[PDB]
Structures are given as C-alpha cells and as structure tokens.
Design a protein around this ligand. Structure first.
Ligand SMILES: CC(C)CCC[C@@H](C)[C@H]1CC[C@H]2[C@@H]3CC=C4C[C@@H](OC(=O)CCC(=O)O)CC[C@]4(C)[C@H]3CC[C@]12C
Ligand SMILES: CC(C)CCC[C@@H](C)[C@H]1CC[C@H]2[C@@H]3CC=C4C[C@@H](O)CC[C@]4(C)[C@H]3CC[C@]12C
Ligand SMILES: OC[C@H]1O[C@H](O[C@H]2[C@H](O)[C@@H](O)[C@H](O)O[C@@H]2CO)[C@H](O)[C@@H](O)[C@@H]1O
Ligand SMILES: OC[C@H]1O[C@H](O[C@H]2[C@H](O)[C@@H](O)[C@H](O)O[C@@H]2CO)[C@H](O)[C@@H](O)[C@@H]1O
Ligand SMILES: OC[C@H]1O[C@H](O[C@H]2[C@H](O)[C@@H](O)[C@H](O)O[C@@H]2CO)[C@H](O)[C@@H](O)[C@@H]1O
Ligand SMILES: OC[C@H]1O[C@H](O[C@H]2[C@H](O)[C@@H](O)[C@H](O)O[C@@H]2CO)[C@H](O)[C@@H](O)[C@@H]1O
Ligand SMILES: OC[C@H]1O[C@H](O[C@H]2[C@H](O)[C@@H](O)[C@H](O)O[C@@H]2CO)[C@H](O)[C@@H](O)[C@@H]1O
Ligand SMILES: *[C@@H]1O[C@H](CO)[C@@H](O)[C@H](O)[C@H]1NC(C)=O
Ligand SMILES: NCCc1ccc(Cl)c(Cl)c1
Ligand SMILES: [Cl-]
Ligand code: NA
Ligand code: NA
Lengths: 535, 219, 214
C-alpha cells in the first residue's frame, strides 16, 4: 500500500517527456515528411496520432497510475488470463536495451573525437580513406563514399573489416569503453530509483531542447536554408493515397510515443492516485510531436545548406537513421565556421536524447520485476548491477567490427510490429475483457471525470482496427533483411523472428498456462482469469 | 567495319566553352541517329543528348539543356557537341554512340574523349625512384617502384624499360588530392636480373609536355 | 526522370556458378525498350542485351535476361573469368534516357596474403623539400585491406594516399599503394618508419619497417 512517488510533479513529466523524445524525432519524422511530401504527411501522421497514438498513450499512463504496479503485475491484476501481455511487453524493452545503448555510445565516441578544430571526417587524405573517397556526397551507392561516410564506416565501426553478421571480428575497446560509460551513466541514474531518476531527467530531457534552439538559429542563418525547409514542409497531398505512408505514420506515431514498452505503465505507477493523468497525457503527447516538427527544420535547414553551397543533390543528403546524424549532418557541420562547437553540442544532444529514453526502457523492466519479486526490491542496487552487466557483456557484440550488422538486426526485428500486436491486445483486453465502462469508472475516481466517448471509441474500435489492419499490411510488404549491398543470410532473418515472436508468443503462452493451472470447470476457470484483483 | 572516334576535349575552366567531335565510318551516317553519353569519375552513365538521322529531332537531358548544342554534318560524317558555361560537375568521359533504333538500343560506341573542368592549372609531374632498403632483403624476387607525384590533369603514360617487361608490373590509378594527381607503380623481378640489368621508369605527361625516363639506382 | 536502380552494386562469383542482377525502374518501362550493356574496365561500353531478351551479336548463349514493367533481370548460366565486367541496364521508353546504377561483377578466388614492400623517400624529393614514404601491398584477396602509418611507435593518419588496383586478368588478386607524405624537415626529425598489412589472411599484421640508420 505504501509506494514511493515522484519527489516532484516535474520529475514525472520530464521522465515521460524524456523517454518519449528520442533520436527517432530527429532521425525519421523529418525524413518521413520529406519522402511523404511535407506538411501533407502531417495529415496521416496527425490522423493516426490522434485516433491511434494518443488514446493508447493515455491508456497506459491511466492504467499505470490506477493499478499502481509494474508492467507485469499490472496486467496480472487486470486480466489474469492476459497476464502474458505483461511479460511480452517487458522482455521487448529487454531486447531494445541491447541494441539501443550503442547509439548513445556512438554519440559519445563522436563526442570524444570531437575535440580538435580539424574534424577527422572532413577530407579524404587520411589512412582509413580509399581512392573512391569523395568530398561530400556522390551517389550512392555504389563504390564511392564520402569523407564523413568513410570515417564512420571504415574507422569508427570498421564495418569494412567484416563480411557479414557471421564474422564479428575483433572487439573495438574504444567503443567498449564508450558502451561501458553509457551503461555506467544509466546505472547511477537508476541507482537509487526514481528518487535520483526523477531529478536526473531535468538535464537529459531539457538539454536537447537547448541544443535544438542553437542549431535551429545556426541552421536558418545559413545560405539556402529556406530551400531545405521547402523539401521539408512542401505540401503535396497526393501522398495520402499510398498504403505505406499510413503504416509509417502509424509505426512512427507508436514508436515515437512509446506505448507498449511498459514504460508509461511503470512511470505512471509512481504517480499519486488523484493526480491528473489526462492533462499529463495531452501535454506530453504535444511536446513530443512538437519536438519532431521543430527538429524537422533543424535538419533540413542544414540539409538545404548542403544542396546550395556544398553542391550536392538534396536527394542524396536526405536520410534517416544513424546515417544522417553520424555522416550527413556532421559533413555539413564540418564546413561551417566554429564547426568544433556545433559538433560537440550535437553529439552531446544525441546522447542526451537516447539516455532519458533508455532510462524508461530500463525502469520498465526493473519496476515490473520489483513488484513481481520483492526479493529484488530490497536488493535493487545489486539487481540492476547484474542486469546491466548482462547488457554490457552481450553488448560487447555491438562493439565488434561487424557490430553494426548486429545492431541493424535488432533495430529491425527486436522491437517492431510486435508492439503493434502487443498494444493491440492491450486495447482489446482493456476495452473488451476488462471492459471500457469499468475502465472509465476508474478514471472517474482518479481525475474526477470519466473519459469522453471519443477516447472510448478509439480504445474499443478505432485503435484495434487501425492496428490489426496496419500490422497486417506490414507483413505483406516484408523484405528479407538487407543492409546496403549486404544481404543477411536466411538463418539470420530467422533469429530475428524468434526475437520478435518470443514476446508476442507470451500472450497465448501464459494464457494457456494459467488456464490449465486453475482448479475448476473450463468456463469457471475462464471466469477466474477474467476477474480483477478484489473483484 | 563500323568505327567511332571521339576527338577534342581537355582541361577547361568553369564557365568556359568547348565543342567535341565524333568521327563516323563503316556505315551510312545519315541513316542513324546519334547520341552523347558521358561517364563520371564515379563511373555512372548519363545520357546527354540525341540527334536524329536528319538532325530534325533533338533531345537533351535536363542537366545540360540549353548549355549544350548537338549538331550534325552528314556530308563529312561528323557528329558535334558544342558546350558552354561548363561547370565542375560536367567533368566526364564523353562517348559517341548510335542510337538509331530505340528498341535495339545503342549498338556501337566509340573510344571516347575525356573532358576535365576545373579551376586548377596544368603542372608537370615529378617522378621519383623507389629503391629498396640497403642490404637487408635477399630473395628469389625483388620489388621496385616509380612514384609520379603532383601532376595535373590526367592522364599519364607510365611504362618500364620502354614497355619491354609488362609482367609483374602493377600501375596504380592516380588519386586526386587537392587539385593534384599522384600515381605510383610497382614492378617485381628476379634478383638475378637486377641490378645486373638496367631498370628504368618511363613516364609521359603530354599536358605539360613532360617526357621523363629514369633508372632506379640502389644508391 | 525515370530512375533505374541496379543491385547488387558489387558481386563476387566463382566461375561456373550462375549469377543474376536486377534492374528496377521508378516508372513502368516497355519490355521492348529496355537493354543491357557490358563494360570491361578501362574500355568502352558494349550492347549486350536488347528488348529485355534478345542477345546482341557476339554475346555467348550463357547470357540471358527477363522481366517486365518496373522489374528486370540479367542472368549468366555459367560464369567465366572473361565475363567479369560492369553491367548497365537502360530504358529508351521515354526521355531523358537513363542508365541504371550498374552491377560490378568480380571473380572470387582463394585467399592470398599480401606481399608487402616499404620504400624510403627518394633523395631527389628530399632536395625538393618534400618527403614521401611509399608502401606496396601486392597480389592478395580479397581487396579490402587496412594500413597504419607509424613514423615512430606512434601512428600517423593524416596525409596518406591509398590506391587500389583493378582485378588482375590472370591471378585475380589485387594490389594497394599507400603513400605517407611529409616535409623534408618533418621526415628527417624521425628515423624508423613502419608500414603494415592488416588483412583477412592473418590475425597478425604484416609489418615492414625501415630506419634511416642504414
Ligand atoms: C504539433 C503538430 C505538428 C501536430 C499536433 C496534432 C494535434 C493538433 C492534433 C493530434 C491529436 C488531436 C487531439 C486528439 C484528441 C481530442 C478529441 C477531443 O477531446 C474531447 O472530446 C474533449 C476532452 C474531454 O473533456 O474529455 C478534442 C480535440 C482533441 C484534444 C484533439 C485536438 C487536436 C490534436 C491535438
Ligand atoms: C522548441 C525549442 C526551440 C524550444 C523549447 C523550449 C523548452 C525549454 C520548453 C519546451 C517544452 C517545455 C516544457 C513543457 C512543460 C513543462 C511542464 C512544467 O510542469 C515544467 C516545465 C516544462 C517541462 C516545460 C519546460 C520548458 C520546455 C522544455
Ligand atoms: O587513438 C587515440 C585517441 O585519439 C584518436 O584520434 C584522435 C586523436 O586526437 C588523434 O589520434 C588525432 O588527432 O585524431 C583524432 C582527433 O584529433 C581517437 O579519438 C581514439 O582512437 C582515441 O581517443
Ligand atoms: O591536440 C593539439 C591541438 O591540435 C589538434 O590537432 C592537430 C594537433 O597538431 C595534434 O593533435 C595532431 O597532430 O593532430 C592535428 C594535426 O597536427 C586538435 O585540434 C586539438 O587536440 C588541439 O587543439
Ligand atoms: O581496430 C582498431 C585497432 O585497435 C583495436 O584495438 C586494439 C588492437 O589490439 C591494437 O590496435 C592495439 O594493439 O591495441 C588496441 C587497443 O589498445 C583493434 O583490436 C585492432 O585490430 C586494430 O589494430
Ligand atoms: O564463427 C566466427 C569466428 O569468429 C568469431 O569471433 C571471434 C573468434 O574467436 C575468432 O574469429 C577470433 O579469434 O576472435 C573473434 C572475437 O575476437 C567467433 O566468435 C568464432 O567462434 C569463430 O572463429
Ligand atoms: O516490414 C515489417 C518488418 O520491418 C518493419 O520495420 C520497418 C521497415 O522499414 C519495413 O519492414 C516496413 O516499412 O516496416 C517498418 C517501417 O514502416 C517492422 O518494424 C519489423 O518489426 C518487421 O519485421
Ligand atoms: C578552425 O579553423 C578555421 C580556419 O582557420 C577557423 O575559421 C575556425 O574559426 C576555427 N574553429 C575553431 C573552433 O577554432
Ligand atoms: N523511441 C522511444 C521508445 C523507446 C526508446 C528507447 C528504449 Cl530503450 C525503449 Cl525500451 C523504448
Ligand atoms: Cl514523431
Ligand atoms: Na519519439
Ligand atoms: Na530522450
């Protein structure tokens, strides 16, 4: 009955804001708008965000605060038949932690390499360079990289020394040190729990916005900056016709708000019962999407600068993922005056963008396991020590020469499209089995008023329909995993499916398990599993 | 039978203008449409323009449109491309091809002529000998070298002993770094041959009118 | 513009194996208007396949092609060393005419350790004020190779020009030329320079070191 709460109201907000706002905001959303025809993409993004994204974001924060327990125990007390959901959601966050923290490590590694006036990714005359090295951005592919590309590929990653995922090669110990530093930072933040964790996010969540503002001014102060904003927000509305633009908006809206990781469930579990979640859900949702929209200008203002002064096609300078932040953007930074300054804050922003996001992922596992196993709660300092040790040791695979191939595998299979089916079951379990009326009755007792029928319609009908169908059309367009000119072996693709499925299969797994464990008639055993804690 | 030879081309400064010619023989020239295809230093093929058999139908790429003018002379069997306001991205090797039947593609291409557009200016290459470290290595084979450094523009002609021995010779392609080309070469031969015989590095850079033949002394 | 993307970009193949390269267009292309070109290194392109199917004159029957719309492919039944080249698909359906990205076909052989040779700066260069150390790595497979430059126990990255060769028409191995450039001053301040071969053929780097003592 006695459970610790955030030492302040802002601790929870910045913790959720920090977790919600990640590299994905800078990476994809700006790029998505470019490919999808600008502000016209806001429509499918906004539509899917409104019906699908927010209501589910609202649902977890509501469920977390009301049931006052971790992700696993929360679904156990809600729908004991579906308690497998709590396991599926948590071990997904367990997988992500493996491949995600390396991004923060790359941020630090570039940050460490960022002390000099002469940036190593500027010209082609170094040793790691090849005769095919070009100044900025030819193509590509194929065969001719850039100074920023070859520096990242042939030195930092040294992926050129690996022939695929089957050969990891030697372990880079400068990355191992960086990865260690990353897990160390994650460790002392979650060391004492949300006590320290609450006031740590005051930096990691807020800091990126400081650098965002600086790079926004510096970005729009450059020649051809307005030209990049054109490729960004230019409103071609014919893009709404395509089927993939809706699944991207959906998958982006879901991955951006981060429901289904059990993080919102954990974070909200430390909230006070009568605290207003609906207000926090709305505010947090906006700040995240707003940060993306803002970041869109920051990227393309610089991208436009390259397509004017640097003499390159905007086609080749527009990219998502680590390629943008670790290659293209630094390439543009290297040319402009006081380059060493922009590089430092940029990479530091990348690290502070991933850290507070990783915090939620870790806390989702810790809080979920702590409520399930009291032996962990008292020993928590020792528990999180071993967990991160597992992450680091296994994460050493990410620090190998072929480490990126390992990264791209989890970036693909580890968590995606499972969150959809995982969140799909969350909505159905709440709206149907547990019921909407009983859930709205809970929110009434908490914030003082029941959710508008608009929210109830999304939970019961819209979300599951806009999930189940979009999650299906993603399976139709499925490509066997390939990176660049490299094509992953058939066995590698299978290993990823096990990872993606190991969670989702927990739904029927614990369902059938607890179903045959309970003494009684089949229909009675069903009723036993559909009843909440005191009900 | 059919033969196509591209002429002209060379170093031009940005904004400058130049025209290239293509000599045609072995077929009736007025009966075939011709086109200009260029290949960048990154080795990607890009179609430039196409002229009809009578020259009454012209097509250009959006890149070179209005800057380049493709002409035709059916009397002397010559194909022309007249450029203007050239830019650094116009640098490539231009090919003359036909081009008559759209369903069968281009069935004949020429040797090609190279066009280089840069603000840089011609400079003669400096050839240096590569002599192995004193004493030390004794083996069945030995490797010499010739370093051609700081020249522009391409190409250069490097041969060993006037092209006597082409076996065991690796001539590395030049690499442009800050408006300067650097080209080296390696030659491996038996220790009984050298230095019991004369081994020289022949380098030719017609652009600067530079002809340099130099032997490799163990000194 | 109608873009043609070819994959794979680079392809290694053992003689006798079959290979297939794909060409996909952004806009639909008539099967009659798409063609393939083979270009040998340092030579002019040649018409290979026209109308997506029919082979040009001189092309062996080992070559074939198919596909329609936005999808096309070239296939070699039994690959030979003479078939190593870069292949370009193209569409004449509409202007402007556009070549594909191209597929580079390289032969694959048994792994060979590089033969490394280091050379000191020429005396005629040292009089010019510059000094450049050259290092050769010859006849090895595969092509990817890495080189440190050490003027001392320490490593020097800056001011280095690497040059890879093309595939040898005989032994199918490769060669690299690494040049470390220094001033006649900076070079004479230190004595022992070290080169290296870091390759798949060995766990240990192949080292070649010379001193100014001799
Ligand atoms: C920042 C930019 C780039 C994107 C922002 C998108 C928003 C303008 C859209 C997406 C989600 C929308 C919201 C989704 C849910 C509701 C339904 C509706 O809520 C109610 O029924 C009343 C609330 C209650 O008291 O229960 C009022 C509009 C609102 C807040 C929408 C207002 C407009 C929103 C915020
Ligand atoms: C877009 C860029 C250029 C400007 C962003 C400015 C930053 C500082 C803004 C944007 C969103 C804002 C936050 C959103 C709302 C809250 C909740 C409040 O209880 C504490 C302050 C806090 C956390 C705000 C602090 C200031 C804030 C972080
Ligand atoms: O390798 C040793 C450390 O420095 C590396 O390279 C840095 C360093 O300053 C120096 O080698 C040279 O100046 O290049 C860069 C930036 O200046 C890398 O940072 C890491 O290997 C090590 O931190
Ligand atoms: O590190 C010394 C300062 O210059 C560095 O870059 C130079 C420097 O001479 C040295 O580190 C090494 O040689 O790399 C380059 C070229 O010499 C960096 O700018 C910073 O570390 C310092 O400002
Ligand atoms: O790949 C980068 C190079 O160093 C790495 O780490 C080791 C390596 O054993 C070697 O460089 C040197 O002896 O120690 C460093 C760490 O101090 C890689 O392991 C090496 O393969 C590379 O040479
Ligand atoms: O099957 C892959 C092989 O290499 C991997 O990486 C290891 C391995 O021990 C070996 O290649 C090399 O000596 O060390 C690297 C890591 O440093 C696998 O782990 C090995 O099982 C295989 O030999
Ligand atoms: O296609 C579903 C599989 O990949 C997805 O990841 C990406 C990827 O770009 C592509 O497969 C498709 O467009 O879906 C998203 C982007 O929309 C899923 O995330 C994976 O879980 C699936 O294995
Ligand atoms: C780096 O050097 C350049 C060229 O001298 C100069 O313009 C720039 O201000 C310097 N940057 C820093 C951070 O010192
Ligand atoms: N991209 C925000 C969602 C997210 C980010 C990081 C992690 Cl580690 C997790 Cl579990 C979830
Ligand atoms: Cl977003
Ligand atoms: Na996000
Ligand atoms: Na974050």
């Amino acid at each position: 009955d006695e459970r610790e709460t955030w030492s302040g109201k802002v601790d929870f907000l910045l913790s959720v804001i920090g977790f919600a706002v990640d590299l994905a905001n800078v990476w994809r959303f700006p790029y998505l708008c470019y490919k999808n025809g600008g502000g016209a993409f806001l429509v499918p993004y906004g539509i899917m965000l409104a019906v699908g994204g927010i209501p589910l974001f609202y649902m977890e924060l509501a469920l977390g605060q009301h049931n006052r327990k971790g992700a696993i125990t929360c679904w156990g007390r809600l729908v004991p038949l579906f308690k497998g959901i709590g396991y599926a959601v948590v071990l997904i966050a367990f997988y992500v932690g493996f491949y995600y923290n390396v991004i923060i490590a790359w941020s630090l590694r570039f940050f460490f390499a960022s002390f000099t006036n002469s940036l190593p990714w500027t010209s082609c005359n170094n040793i790691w360079n090849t005769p095919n090295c070009r100044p900025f951005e030819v193509g590509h592919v194929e065969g001719f990289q850039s100074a920023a590309s070859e520096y990242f590929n042939r030195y930092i990653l040294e992926l050129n020394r690996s022939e695929g995922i089957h050969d990891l090669g030697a372990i880079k110990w400068d990355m191992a040190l960086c990865l260690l530093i990353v897990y160390l930072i994650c460790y002392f933040s979650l060391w004492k729990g949300i006590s320290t964790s609450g006031k740590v996010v005051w930096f990691t969540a807020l800091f990126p916005y400081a650098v965002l503002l600086i790079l926004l001014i510096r970005g729009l102060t450059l020649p051809g900056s307005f030209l990049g904003i054109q490729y960004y927000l230019t409103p071609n509305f014919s893009a709404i016709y395509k089927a993939e633009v809706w699944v991207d908006a959906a998958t982006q809206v879901f991955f951006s708000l981060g429901p289904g990781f059990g993080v919102l469930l954990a974070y909200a579990s430390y909230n006070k019962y009568h605290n207003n979640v609906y207000k926090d859900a709305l505010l947090t949702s906006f700040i995240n999407s707003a940060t993306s929209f803002i970041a869109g200008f920051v990227i393309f203002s610089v991208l436009g600068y390259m397509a004017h002064t640097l003499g390159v096609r905007i086609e080749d300078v527009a990219t998502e993922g680590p390629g943008l932040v670790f290659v293209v953007y630094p390439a543009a930074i290297a040319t402009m005056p006081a380059s060493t300054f922009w590089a430092l804050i940029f990479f530091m922003m990348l690290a502070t963008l991933g850290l507070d996001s990783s915090f939620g992922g870790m806390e989702a596992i810790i809080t979920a396991l702590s409520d399930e196993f009291p032996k962990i709660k008292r020993n928590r300092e020792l528990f999180v020590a071993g967990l991160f040790s597992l992450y680091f040791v296994v994460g050493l695979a990410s620090c190998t020469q072929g480490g990126f191939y390992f990264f791209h595998l989890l970036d693909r299979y580890a968590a995606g499209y499972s969150i959809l089916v995982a969140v799909f079951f969350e909505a159905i379990a709440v709206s149907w089995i547990y019921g909407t009326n009983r859930f709205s009755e809970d929110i009434r007792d908490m914030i003082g008023f029941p959710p508008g029928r608009y929210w109830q319609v999304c939970w019961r009908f819209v979300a599951p329909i806009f999930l189940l169908f979009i999650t299906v059309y993603g399976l139709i367009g499925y490509e066997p995993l390939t990176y660049a000119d490299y094509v992953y072996p058939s066995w590698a693709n299978a290993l990823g499916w096990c990872i993606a499925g190991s969670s989702v299969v927990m739904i029927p797994a614990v369902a059938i398990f607890k179903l045959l464990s309970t003494p009684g008639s089949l229909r009675q055993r069903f009723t036993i599993l559909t009843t909440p804690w005191r009900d | 039978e059919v033969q196509l030879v591209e002429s002209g081309g060379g170093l031009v400064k940005p904004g400058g203008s130049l025209k290239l010619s293509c000599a045609a023989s072995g077929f009736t020239f007025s009966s075939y449409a011709m086109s200009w295809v260029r290949q960048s230093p990154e080795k990607r093929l890009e179609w430039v323009a196409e002229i009809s058999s009578g020259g009454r139908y012209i097509y250009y790429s959006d890149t070179v449109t209005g800057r380049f003018t493709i002409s035709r002379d059916n009397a002397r069997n010559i194909l022309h491309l007249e450029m203007s306001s050239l830019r650094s991205e116009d640098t490539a090797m231009y090919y003359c091809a036909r081009g008559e039947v759209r369903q069968r593609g281009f069935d004949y291409w020429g040797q090609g002529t190279t066009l280089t557009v840069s603000s840089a200016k011609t400079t003669a290459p400096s050839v240096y000998p590569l002599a192995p470290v004193c004493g030390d290595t004794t083996g069945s084979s030995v490797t010499l070298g010739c370093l051609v450094k700081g020249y522009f523009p391409e190409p250069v002609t490097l041969t060993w002993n006037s092209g006597s021995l082409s076996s065991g010779v690796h001539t590395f392609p030049a690499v442009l770094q800050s408006d300067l080309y650097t080209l080296s070469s390696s030659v491996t031969v038996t220790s009984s041959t050298w230095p019991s015989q004369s081994i020289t590095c022949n380098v030719a850079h017609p652009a600067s009118s530079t002809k340099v033949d130099k032997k490799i002394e163990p000194r | 513009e109608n873009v043609l993307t070819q994959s794979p970009a680079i392809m290694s193949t053992s003689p006798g194996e079959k290979v297939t390269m794909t060409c996909r267009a952004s806009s639909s292309v008539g099967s009659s208007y798409l063609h393939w070109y083979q270009q040998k290194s340092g030579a002019s392109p040649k018409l290979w396949i026209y109308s997506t199917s029919n082979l040009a004159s001189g092309v062996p029957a080992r070559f074939s092609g198919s596909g329609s719309g936005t999808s096309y492919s070239l296939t070699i039944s039994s690959v030979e060393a003479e078939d190593a080249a870069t292949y370009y698909c193209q569409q004449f359906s509409g202007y402007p005419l556009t070549f594909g990205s191209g597929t580079k076909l390289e032969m694959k052989r048994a792994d060979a350790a590089p033969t490394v040779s280091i050379f000191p700066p020429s005396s005629e260069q040292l009089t010019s004020g510059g000094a450049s150390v050259v290092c050769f790595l010859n006849n090895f497979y595969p092509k990817d190779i890495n080189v440190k430059w050490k003027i001392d126990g320490s490593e020097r990255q800056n001011g280095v020009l690497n040059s890879w060769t093309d595939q040898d028409s005989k032994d199918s191995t490769y060669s690299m030329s690494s040049t470390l450039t220094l001033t006649k001053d900076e070079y004479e301040r230190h004595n022992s320079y070290t080169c290296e071969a870091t390759h798949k053929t060995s766990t240990s780097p192949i080292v070649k070191s010379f001193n100014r003592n001799e």
